[PDB]
Amino acid sequence: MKLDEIARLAGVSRTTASYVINGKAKQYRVSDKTVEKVMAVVREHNYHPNAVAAGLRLQ
């Protein structure tokens, strides 16, 4: 379930859905509106990013 389908199935764009796939919605401009909208599809299909991601400190 690539970014493309998750965007069309949820109802956003290849990047707006990209926000929702990585859990970055608030960082961009989809604080909730697209979270439940696109996250419901990202988690329905279980689509997640690959290993090794920037965040060694993470607070």
Swiss-Prot record:
Which regions of the protein are recorded as binding DNA?
A: 3-22
User: HTH lacI-type domain location, by residue?
Assistant: 1-57
**Superkingdom of the source species:** Bacteria
Protein purpose: Global transcriptional regulator, which plays an important role in the regulation of carbon metabolism. Activates transcription of genes encoding biosynthetic and oxidative enzymes (involved in Krebs cycle, glyoxylate shunt and gluconeogenesis, such as ppsA and fbp). Represses genes involved in sugar catabolism, such as fruB, pfkA, pykF and adhE. Binds asymmetrically to the two half-sites of its operator.
State the remark under miscellaneous: Activation of transcription is observed when the Cra operator is upstream of the RNA polymerase binding site. Inhibition of transcription is observed when the operator overlaps or is downstream of the RNA polymerase binding site.
Quaternary structure, from the entry: Homotetramer.
> What name does UniProt use for this protein?
Catabolite repressor/activator
User: Which organism is the protein's source?
Assistant: Escherichia coli (strain K12)
At the highest ranks, the source species' classification is: Bacteria, Pseudomonadati, Pseudomonadota, Gammaproteobacteria, Enterobacterales
Q: State the encoding gene.
A: cra
Q: Which residues of the full protein are shown?
A: 1 to 57 of 334
